[PDB]
């Protein structure tokens, strides 16, 4: 089965940069678009990146998505970290049957 492997925590001080990845297992990351969601406790996820690297309207440009074909991975980078960025982030894509697959999630802690 196609799975997405994600580390579960990163932490930095305000103003710094964090990045974390989502690695494909059982399939190629490049075959399907990768999305990233931010999620706050008890609330629905909101899109921060769709279609590998696109930001919806209103998402600050300090959020950026990338794909590393050689590593079979997708990454989310948050520059100029803000206190309000402390939340959980999930990558998401699709398997060969067009069904949804989620990464395990990363908690960004702002110090």
Curated annotation (Swiss-Prot):
GO terms for molecular function: antigen binding. Residues 1-98 form the Ig-like domain. This is Immunoglobulin lambda variable 6-57. Residues 46-78 are annotated as: Disordered. Residues 34-50 are annotated as: Framework-2. Residues 64-78 have a biased composition (Low complexity). Keywords: Adaptive immunity, Cell membrane, Disulfide bond, Immunity, Immunoglobulin, Immunoglobulin domain, Membrane, Secreted, Signal. Residues 26-33 are annotated as: Complementarity-determining-1. Residues 92-98 are annotated as: Complementarity-determining-3. Disulfide bonds join 22-91. Residues 51-53 are annotated as: Complementarity-determining-2. It is found in: Secreted; Cell membrane. Residues 1-25 are annotated as: Framework-1. One of its GO terms (cellular component) is plasma membrane. GO terms for biological process: adaptive immune response; immune response. The keyword Cell membrane applies. Residues 54-91 are annotated as: Framework-3. V region of the variable domain of immunoglobulin light chains that participates in the antigen recognition. Immunoglobulins, also known as antibodies, are membrane-bound or secreted glycoproteins produced by B lymphocytes. In the recognition phase of humoral immunity, the membrane-bound immunoglobulins serve as receptors which, upon binding of a specific antigen, trigger the clonal expansion and differentiation of B lymphocytes into immunoglobulins-secreting plasma cells. The gene is IGLV6-57. Immunoglobulins are composed of two identical heavy chains and two identical light chains; disulfide-linked. Transmembrane segments: none annotated.
